[PDB]
Design a protein around this ligand. Structure first.
Ligand SMILES: *[C@@H]1O[C@H](CO)[C@@H](O[C@@H]2O[C@H](CO)[C@@H](O)[C@H](O)[C@H]2NC(C)=O)[C@H](O)[C@H]1NC(C)=O
Length: 362
C-alpha cells in the first residue's frame, strides 16, 4: 500500500535532538514523503522557510538511492490562513496564476507532485475547492501530455464530519485527486474540558464519547460512503499525542481537565507531545489501553496524553487493510522517534516502521 509521510519544515528549529532535517529521514521508510508547507505569494507557489530550497534538495536526495520514493510539496498549512487561500481559489485569475506556477516549481525543485493542505476551506469554499483541485489536475496532465511522468496531486482533508460536510465535495474531488490523506486525529480538543483520545480507531464506549463521529472509523467510512474510492483513501495515523492537564485524581477517559498538557521539552507546544517526547513521559507513567478505541493513553501526575504506539498503529493498519484503503498517512516523521534514541531499542522511526511492517505483513 501507500505510506504517505509528512515532514514539517519547522521541525528543523527544535532544540537539540529535537531538530529534524530531511537528511535525517530514512529514504526506504515511506513511499511518499510530503514536505510541509509551501506558501503562495503573488498567486505563485513559493517557498515558506528561508532554507526551503536547501531542505527541498536534502529531501529529494533521498530519491537517489531509492527511485521508487515519490515526493510531494504541500501547499497550505495552518499558518497560511484559509482566508488568503480562499481568495486565491475564489478569484479566477489568481487561481490560474497559482495553478500554472506549480508544475515549474515542482520540476525545478525535484518534487513528484503537489499536496493541497488547505486547512480548511470555509462553507463558502466548497465549490472553489472542487474547482481548484479539478484545474490543478488539469495542468498536471497537460504539463505531462508530451510524455513526462505526471505530477501527483493529493490533498490533506479534515476527518471531522462538520468540516467534511461544509467544505468538501468528496464525490467530485475524489475523481481528480490521486489520493486523499484523511487527517484522522485531533478528534478531541482540550476545549471540551475532558480527557479524550484524539485519535481513536472506533467510537468505543457509547457513554464515554462526546461525538458519534470523533473517531477514525467513522471518518474513513463516512468518506467512503461520500464517494471517496477506497483505493484513493489514505488514512492518517498520528505519531504525536494530544495532552491534557488533569484537574483531579480521575485519570480515565472523560476525566476533568484544567487545560492542555504541559508543553513537551522539544515540541514546546501545550497539548502536544511528539512520540519521542511521549517515550520519555512513559517513563514512570501508566499506560491504559482504551477498549473499544484500540488506542492507548498514558497518565502520570496531572498529565494525560492520548497517543498512538506500535500496537495501536498496527491495529489501525489492519483496520485500513480490512477496509482496502490506499494506505496509511503519517503525521509526522519529525514527531516519531526519528533519532531512535528516546524509545530505546535504538530503532529509528518506531511508529512509522511499525506501520510499514504492518502494511507489508500477511
Ligand atoms: C506568504 O505569502 C504572503 C502573501 O504574499 C506573505 O504575506 C505578506 O507579508 C508582508 C509582511 O509580512 C505583508 O506586508 C503583506 O501585506 C503580506 N501579503 C499578504 C497577501 O498577506 C507572507 O509573509 C508569506 N509567508 C511566508 C512564510 O513566506
Amino acid at each position: 500500500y501507500k505510506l504517505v509521510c509528512y515532514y514539517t519544515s519547522w521541525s528543523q528549529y527544535r532544540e537539540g535532538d529535537g531538530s529534524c532535517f530531511p537528511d535525517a529521514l530514512d529514504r526506504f521508510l515511506c513511499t511518499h514523503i510530503i514536505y510541509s508547507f509551501a506558501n503562495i505569494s503573488n498567486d505563485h507557489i513559493d517557498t515558506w522557510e528561508w532554507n526551503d530550497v536547501t531542505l527541498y534538495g536534502m529531501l529529494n536526495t533521498l530519491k537517489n538511492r531509492n527511485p521508487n520514493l515519490k515526493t510531494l510539496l504541500s501547499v497550505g498549512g495552518w499558518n497560511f490562513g484559509s482566508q488568503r487561500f480562499s481568495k486565491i481559489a475564489s478569484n479566477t485569475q489568481s487561481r490560474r496564476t497559482f495553478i500554472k506556477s506549480v508544475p515549474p516549481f515542482l520540476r525545478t525543485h525535484g518534487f513528484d507532485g503537489l499536496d493541497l493542505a488547505w486547512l480548511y476551506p470555509g462553507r463558502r469554499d466548497k465549490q472553489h475547492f472542487t474547482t481548484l483541485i479539478k484545474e490543478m489536475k488539469a495542468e498536471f496532465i497537460k504539463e505531462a501530455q508530451p510524455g513526462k511522468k505526471q505530477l501527483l496531486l493529493s490533498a490533506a482533508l479534515s476527518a471531522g464530519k462538520v468540516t467534511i460536510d461544509s467544505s468538501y465535495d468528496i464525490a467530485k474531488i475524489s475523481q481528480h485527486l490521486d489520493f486523499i490523506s484523511i487527517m484522522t486525529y485531533d478528534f478531541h480538543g482540550a476545549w471540551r474540558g475532558t480527557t479524550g483520545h484524539h485519535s481513536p480507531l472506533f467510537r468505543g464506549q457509547e457513554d464515554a464519547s462526546p461525538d458519534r463521529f470523533s473517531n477514525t472509523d467513522y471518518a474513513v467510512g463516512y468518506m467512503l460512503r461520500l464517494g471517496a474510492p477506497a483505493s484513493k483513501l489514505v488514512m492518517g495515523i498520528p505519531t504525536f499525542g494530544r495532552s491534557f492537564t488533569l484537574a483531579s485524581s480521575e485519570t480515565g477517559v472523560g476525566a476533568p481537565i484544567s487545560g492542555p498538557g504541559i508543553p513537551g521539552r522539544f515540541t514546546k507546544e501545550a497539548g502536544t507531545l511528539a512520540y519521542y517526547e511521549i517515550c520519555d513521559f512513559l517513563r514512570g507513567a501508566t499506560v491504559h489501553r482504551i477498549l473499544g478505541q484500540q488506542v492507548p493513553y498514558a497518565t502520570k501526575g496531572n498529565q494525560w496524553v492520548g497517543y498512538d504506539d506500535q500496537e495501536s498503529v498496527k491495529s489501525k493498519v489492519q483496520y485500513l487493510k480490512d477496509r482496502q484503503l490506499a494506505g496509511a498517512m503519517v503525521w509526522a516523521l519529525d514527531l516519531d522517534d526519528f533519532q531512535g534514541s528516546f524509545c530505546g531499542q535504538d530503532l529509528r522511526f518506531p511508529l512509522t516502521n511499525a506501520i510499514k511492517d504492518a502494511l507489508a505483513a500477511t
